[PDB]
């Protein structure tokens, strides 16, 4: 059939040059019956067209507006490949990159590459700062209150959060971390607790980040 093999580094330092290669098999890059281009997709986001090339009377190209100043798509008529090059990269260029074949005449895409996840990050291994999560002017009316811990700015995954040294497992909800533009992760863990015992009962999170040797306990101070 037609095969599209993507190639290139998965990690790029910010403000550097992102470079990928789509090796074609079962067709020619200089085909008069097809067009070749790149499409990217930020994690948890939607598709976005980057650029395209095709050989008619001569080689033509069309680039999306926002990358046009930085993007370059070059057909390698030797190795039967076509490349993608992004100058001056930034964390918002972090995405999954798909190369694709546009079929004439409707320019529909019948073939894709396997897609390569490229991260734009200079993040170093770092220990998180653990801050308490507690509502200020609470004044509850229900038998349930929420408290937790903010595990901010760490690298890399994972981080283990426990409550009261493992004695508190019920009502515990640790959320999947976020990947900020900085390249660092932030995570939250919260507990659903009875509000009738907030005055006597205590709650402490036990955050552990092994790569940086972070062993921090943090008592979540209840406001009243």
């Amino acid at each position: 059939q037609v095969q599209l093999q993507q190639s290139g580094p998965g990690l790029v330092k910010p403000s550097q040059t992102l470079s990928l290669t789509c090796a074609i098999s079962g067709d020619s890059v200089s085909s008069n019956s097809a067009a070749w281009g790149w499409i990217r997709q930020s994690p948890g986001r939607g598709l976005e067209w980057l650029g395209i090339i095709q050989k008619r009377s001569k080689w033509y190209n069309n680039y999306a507006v926002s990358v046009k100043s930085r993007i370059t798509i070059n057909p390698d008529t030797s190795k039967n490949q076509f490349s993608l090059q992004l100058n001056s990269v930034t964390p918002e260029d972090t995405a999954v990159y798909y190369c694709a074949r546009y079929s004439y005449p409707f320019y529909s895409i019948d073939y894709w590459g396997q897609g390569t996840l490229v991260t734009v990050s200079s993040a170093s291994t770092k220990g998180p700062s653990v801050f308490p999560l507690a509502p200020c002017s609470r004044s509850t009316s229900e038998s349930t209150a929420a408290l937790g811990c903010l595990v901010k700015d760490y690298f890399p995954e994972p981080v283990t959060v426990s409550w009261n040294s493992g004695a508190l497992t019920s009502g515990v909800h640790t959320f999947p971390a976020v990947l900020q533009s900085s390249g660092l992760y932030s995570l939250s863990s919260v507990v659903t607790v009875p509000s009738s015992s907030l005055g006597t009962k205590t709650y402490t999170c036990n955050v552990d980040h092994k790569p940086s040797n972070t062993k921090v306990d943090k008592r979540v101070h209840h406001h009243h």
């Binding site: 948890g44 939607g46 529909s108 019948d110 396997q114 929420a146 999947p176 939250s188 919260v190």
Partner: protein, 211 residues
């Protein structure tokens, strides 16, 4: 050009799903439809407004007229659950995609999101930093739109929002983070976390005057 799609469409097994793709005179050019499942490259399901390529089940159908292109699925199967993107062509750019639409096939009752908003802690303020934490849990289907506000004006700067993920109860969780300076936190009188889940917006609000 911009092709507007609904962020989410839910449907019970065997019922009809309709996914819109609005745009200024998008009926003047052909529209393609792509299906995308997590971890996979997209798959063409409809080309030339309404044509199905080989292999694509006949329960998929397409339409395009005026300012609305619609992908319709009859007797939606569980396997039809994916992301659906529409695409067309304006000028001079060659290709534009719609924002996308998560299609969910109901395997459990719909569930409104639980939203909790935490203010920055005094420890973080001491460290000359400020962070607002908005936590969203137990919602189904797993698609939400998070909108932050300062007083009444929308805020996009410093907003990091995660991708929805399945919980141990088969429901979904997500969280949004707003990074601020303490001066910013002390300047504005209020901050809000708006969470829209299928046309229903749950709002939580914190203020620096609460402590």
């Amino acid at each position: 050009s911009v092709l507007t799609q609904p962020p989410s469409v839910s449907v019970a097994p065997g019922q009809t799903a309709r996914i819109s793709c609005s745009g200024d005179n998008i009926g003047s050019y052909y529209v393609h439809w792509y299906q995308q499942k997590p971890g996979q490259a997209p798959v063409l399901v409809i080309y030339e407004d309404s044509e199905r390529p080989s292999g694509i089940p006949e329960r998929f159908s397409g339409s395009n007229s005026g300012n609305t292109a619609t992908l319709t699925i009859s007797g939606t199967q569980a396997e039809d659950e994916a992301d659906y993107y529409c695409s067309s062509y304006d000028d001079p750019n060659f290709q534009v995609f719609g924002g996308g639409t998560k299609l969910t096939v109901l395997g459990q009752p719909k569930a409104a999101p639980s939203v909790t908003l935490f203010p920055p802690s005094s420890e973080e303020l001491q460290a000359n930093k400020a962070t607002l934490v908005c936590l969203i849990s137990d919602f189904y289907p797993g698609a939400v739109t998070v909108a932050w506000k300062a007083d009444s004006s929308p805020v996009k700067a410093g907003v990091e929002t995660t991708t929805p993920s399945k919980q141990s109860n088969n429901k979904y969780a997500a969280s949004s983070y707003l990074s601020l300076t303490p001066e910013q936190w002390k300047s504005h009188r209020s901050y809000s976390c708006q969470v829209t889940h299928e046309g229903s917006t749950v709002e939580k609000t914190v203020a620096p005057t609460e402590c």
